[PDB]
Design a protein around this ligand. Structure first.
Ligand SMILES: [Cl-]
Ligand SMILES: [Mg+2]
Length: 209
């Protein structure tokens, strides 16, 4: 049972901008996604202070970066608060309509695409490097869902079964054929060190066979 949804016109327009604009500094997508994980981890961290049972779905708060050269995927996984189905449908928990407007206004006032995170829509920077993005998420007391989109105006949502996560979000980037540098260990390490070096949770870069 796969449900198909239309992006709001403003989000479709943001995605088309990200896909079509000539913009060489694509590596900022990873900072944006790690920032989103850090925010999600802060949320579960705060909820747990008054309700420790919120960590029954896993106490460890951290981020994993998993490259897979066979599948041409880079996956960013966190054990943050996760998203409900309604959050996924509502622009993955973002204020993307107003954020898109602000980002567009900023761009005409001298901003560039690397400032996208300032407008709360950094997730969509994934489309600088990915042809398809799959988001698997599990929030306490909701079921596990998979969102997916290859842009083009629409996204799908379905329940995800097998490979349960205890809690959090996994962003699976199916990379564009010419963006495979982002599976190389030395390149990912460089980007994490350049742009994510003060994130307050462990970031483990997985090794490949
Ligand atoms: Cl909004
Ligand atoms: Mg912030």
């Amino acid at each position: 049972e796969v449900e198909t949804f239309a992006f709001q016109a403003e989000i479709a327009q943001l995605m088309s901008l990200i896909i079509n604009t000539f913009y060489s500094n694509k590596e900022i997508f990873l900072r944006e996604l790690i920032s989103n994980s850090s925010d999600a981890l802060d949320k579960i961290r705060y909820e747990s202070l008054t309700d420790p049972s919120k960590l029954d779905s896993g106490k460890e708060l951290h981020i994993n970066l998993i490259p897979n050269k066979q599948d041409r995927t880079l996956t960013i996984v966190d054990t943050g608060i996760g998203m409900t189905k309604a959050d996924l449908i509502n622009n993955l928990g973002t204020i993307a309509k107003s954020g898109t407007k602000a980002f567009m206004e900023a761009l005409q006032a001298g901003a560039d695409i690397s400032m996208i995170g300032q407008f709360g829509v950094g997730f969509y920077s994934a489309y600088l490097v990915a042809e398809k993005v799959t988001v698997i998420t599990k929030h306490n007391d909701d079921e596990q869902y998979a969102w997916e989109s290859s842009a083009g105006g629409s996204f799908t949502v379905r329940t995800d079964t097998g490979e349960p996560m205890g809690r959090g979000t996994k962003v699976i980037l199916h990379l564009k054929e010419d963006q495979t540098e982002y599976l190389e260990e030395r390149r990912i390490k460089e980007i994490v060190k350049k742009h994510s070096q003060f994130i307050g949770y462990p970031i483990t870069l997985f090794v490949e066979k």
